Design a protein around this motif. Structure first.
Motif, PDB file in Angstrom:
ATOM      1  N   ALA A 154     -34.861 -39.995 -46.237  1.00  0.00           N
ATOM      2  CA  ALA A 154     -35.018 -41.134 -45.327  1.00  0.00           C
ATOM      3  C   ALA A 154     -34.459 -40.855 -43.946  1.00  0.00           C
ATOM      4  O   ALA A 154     -35.106 -41.159 -42.945  1.00  0.00           O
ATOM      5  CB  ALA A 154     -34.353 -42.354 -45.901  1.00  0.00           C
ATOM      6  N   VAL A 155     -33.256 -40.276 -43.914  1.00  0.00           N
ATOM      7  CA  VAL A 155     -32.606 -39.890 -42.652  1.00  0.00           C
ATOM      8  C   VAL A 155     -33.467 -38.904 -41.855  1.00  0.00           C
ATOM      9  O   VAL A 155     -33.573 -39.009 -40.634  1.00  0.00           O
ATOM     10  CB  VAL A 155     -31.222 -39.264 -42.893  1.00  0.00           C
ATOM     11  N   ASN A 156     -34.042 -37.923 -42.557  1.00  0.00           N
ATOM     12  CA  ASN A 156     -34.878 -36.913 -41.933  1.00  0.00           C
ATOM     13  C   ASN A 156     -36.185 -37.513 -41.408  1.00  0.00           C
ATOM     14  O   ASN A 156     -36.653 -37.098 -40.345  1.00  0.00           O
ATOM     15  CB  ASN A 156     -35.196 -35.828 -42.963  1.00  0.00           C
ATOM     16  N   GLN A 157     -36.746 -38.487 -42.147  1.00  0.00           N
ATOM     17  CA  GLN A 157     -37.997 -39.174 -41.759  1.00  0.00           C
ATOM     18  C   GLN A 157     -37.706 -39.875 -40.433  1.00  0.00           C
ATOM     19  O   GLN A 157     -38.443 -39.724 -39.455  1.00  0.00           O
ATOM     20  CB  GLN A 157     -38.424 -40.231 -42.813  1.00  0.00           C
ATOM     21  N   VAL A 158     -36.595 -40.613 -40.397  1.00  0.00           N
ATOM     22  CA  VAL A 158     -36.218 -41.322 -39.183  1.00  0.00           C
ATOM     23  C   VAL A 158     -36.056 -40.354 -38.003  1.00  0.00           C
ATOM     24  O   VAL A 158     -36.542 -40.646 -36.930  1.00  0.00           O
ATOM     25  CB  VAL A 158     -34.973 -42.197 -39.385  1.00  0.00           C
ATOM     26  N   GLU A 159     -35.425 -39.199 -38.227  1.00  0.00           N
ATOM     27  CA  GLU A 159     -35.230 -38.194 -37.167  1.00  0.00           C
ATOM     28  C   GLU A 159     -36.583 -37.699 -36.633  1.00  0.00           C
ATOM     29  O   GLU A 159     -36.815 -37.600 -35.417  1.00  0.00           O
ATOM     30  CB  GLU A 159     -34.368 -37.030 -37.704  1.00  0.00           C
ATOM     31  N   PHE A 160     -37.476 -37.408 -37.571  1.00  0.00           N
ATOM     32  CA  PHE A 160     -38.814 -36.913 -37.292  1.00  0.00           C
ATOM     33  C   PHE A 160     -39.629 -37.933 -36.514  1.00  0.00           C
ATOM     34  O   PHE A 160     -40.257 -37.574 -35.518  1.00  0.00           O
ATOM     35  CB  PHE A 160     -39.524 -36.521 -38.605  1.00  0.00           C
ATOM     36  N   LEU A 161     -39.627 -39.187 -36.975  1.00  0.00           N
ATOM     37  CA  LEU A 161     -40.341 -40.251 -36.280  1.00  0.00           C
ATOM     38  C   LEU A 161     -39.764 -40.503 -34.899  1.00  0.00           C
ATOM     39  O   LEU A 161     -40.491 -40.818 -33.971  1.00  0.00           O
ATOM     40  CB  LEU A 161     -40.300 -41.536 -37.098  1.00  0.00           C
ATOM     41  N   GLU A 162     -38.449 -40.376 -34.758  1.00  0.00           N
ATOM     42  CA  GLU A 162     -37.857 -40.482 -33.438  1.00  0.00           C
ATOM     43  C   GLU A 162     -38.374 -39.376 -32.501  1.00  0.00           C
ATOM     44  O   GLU A 162     -38.661 -39.643 -31.338  1.00  0.00           O
ATOM     45  CB  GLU A 162     -36.321 -40.506 -33.481  1.00  0.00           C
ATOM     46  N   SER A 163     -38.526 -38.149 -32.999  1.00  0.00           N
ATOM     47  CA  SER A 163     -39.030 -37.075 -32.142  1.00  0.00           C
ATOM     48  C   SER A 163     -40.459 -37.381 -31.752  1.00  0.00           C
ATOM     49  O   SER A 163     -40.828 -37.240 -30.599  1.00  0.00           O
ATOM     50  CB  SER A 163     -38.886 -35.704 -32.806  1.00  0.00           C
ATOM     51  N   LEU A 164     -41.242 -37.861 -32.716  1.00  0.00           N
ATOM     52  CA  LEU A 164     -42.623 -38.254 -32.465  1.00  0.00           C
ATOM     53  C   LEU A 164     -42.663 -39.345 -31.391  1.00  0.00           C
ATOM     54  O   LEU A 164     -43.364 -39.224 -30.382  1.00  0.00           O
ATOM     55  CB  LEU A 164     -43.276 -38.725 -33.759  1.00  0.00           C
ATOM     56  N   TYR A 165     -41.883 -40.395 -31.603  1.00  0.00           N
ATOM     57  CA  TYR A 165     -41.858 -41.515 -30.677  1.00  0.00           C
ATOM     58  C   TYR A 165     -41.565 -41.070 -29.241  1.00  0.00           C
ATOM     59  O   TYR A 165     -42.183 -41.567 -28.279  1.00  0.00           O
ATOM     60  CB  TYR A 165     -40.857 -42.581 -31.155  1.00  0.00           C
TER      61      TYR A 165
END
Lengths: 246, 244
Positions: free
Chosen positions: B143-154
């Motif tokens: 979950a933490v990694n998903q959030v990190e990844f989506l933040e980079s995308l955003y």
């Protein structure tokens, strides 16, 4: 678009509501358009807030808008609608149709830059005389419903004279309704209730991405009574529901 | 930092559901969770992998651009709703597994591996078959990694053109309103086996007013009927915080 045909039966809704107006609906894969009235479809009107589309695009291109994460900080002065008395993103500014933000973008863009992009975009009669912050609102800029669908289709194809990313940014800003099966990108317009004889104009323009098709649309009506305003959405919707689109 | 929010476990008890919710306001440097251990635990991405897969497909030319149509060959597909030509958003929105399997096959093992390294995507383990590592292979992500990844995308900060990041971001739009826009993707590995539950996911972000909230939810699931809890539990936490 490549063809237009008249479907007079589409006047049912207008008649029902006692509205003078036009609807143009086009299908991207056949490049074919239908309308209730060919004549009004080519008549040109003040774009009002529909003009936020090109203005968002030019503000991006000129770097007057930095990027899509731009915050438009509210200074704290009273604004014409309570809806606008807050900080806003581009989509935010577009969705609550905050005039002062785009007036300020228009003012940083400047007469020269504004004027040029409208020629590259073939945007209506391209006439921005009558105040850099007022011309789309009460000046001499005119655009037809056919010209709207052509502008929007160029936008959808990234074929306007801007960077692909700035066109993408604005299309996302235009998302108004999202479902698994369709995506609506749209923008309303309303010039005012008009005066003696001379009514104002209300607009709804956009496109619907559904299955592997795209329906471009442009609606305008005459308006003297501000309460008739919701018809700018309900009449196209009725026609597009009839067609099994949304 | 990740901080436990004790009151969030309430929603998990109520449905008798082991899961985790991770919520970050503004950026991933300040996130909250019901469970610190579960937040960084790594699970099969399932259909949440359509996100990096879509970006990779674009970067590699496998997906020509945003108007690419993925044509249906006429052959049986595992859901009737996937049996049709689909656009990129279309394939993301009905979660058309075979569209993404063909994407993955054309990207190929060497490129797929490189991009997952580049994106810091989970354990970056693509073992198990090019067209199924994210479904039943050795790929795991927290979950933490998903959030990190989506933040980079955003932020358009992934190793990919901004144009491609923008394309995938618009394919992820799932709800629109004047004050907020939700971009999100569901996942569901399956129901698992004796004592080995499947995982269900809802991940994405909400752009509201001038703020952005990144979220990742997962839960253990051994019953397809329990599947709507993957939306309701997180929506119930985001509603309580005034976000949606």
């Amino acid at each position: 678009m490549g063809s237009i045909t008249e479907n007079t039966s589409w006047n049912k809704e207008f008649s029902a509501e006692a509205v003078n107006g036009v609807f143009v609906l086009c299908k991207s894969s056949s490049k074919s358009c239908a309308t209730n009235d060919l004549a009004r479809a080519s008549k040109e009107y003040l774009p009002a807030a529909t003009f936020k589309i090109p203005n968002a695009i030019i503000g991006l291109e000129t770097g007057v808008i930095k990027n899509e994460h731009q915050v438009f900080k509210w200074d704290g002065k009273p604004r014409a609608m309570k809806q606008w008395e807050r900080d806003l993103t581009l989509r935010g500014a577009i969705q609550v149709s905050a005039v002062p933000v785009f007036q300020q973008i228009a003012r940083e863009v400047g007469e020269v830059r504004m004027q040029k992009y409208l020629k590259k975009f073939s945007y209506g009669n391209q006439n921005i005389s009558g105040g850099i912050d007022k011309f789309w609102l009460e000046g001499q800029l005119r655009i037809s419903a056919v010209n709207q669908v052509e502008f929007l289709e160029s936008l959808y194809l990234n074929k306007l004279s801007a960077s692909k990313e700035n066109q993408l940014i604005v299309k996302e800003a235009l998302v108004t309704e999202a479902a698994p099966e369709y995506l609506v990108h749209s923008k309303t317009g309303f010039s005012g209730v008009g005066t003696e004889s001379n009514p104002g104009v209300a607009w709804w323009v956009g496109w619907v991405e559904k299955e592997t098709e795209v329906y471009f649309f442009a609606f305008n009506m005459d308006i003297d009574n501000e309460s008739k305003l919701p018809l700018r959405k309900s009449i196209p919707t009725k026609i597009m529901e009839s067609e099994g689109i949304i």
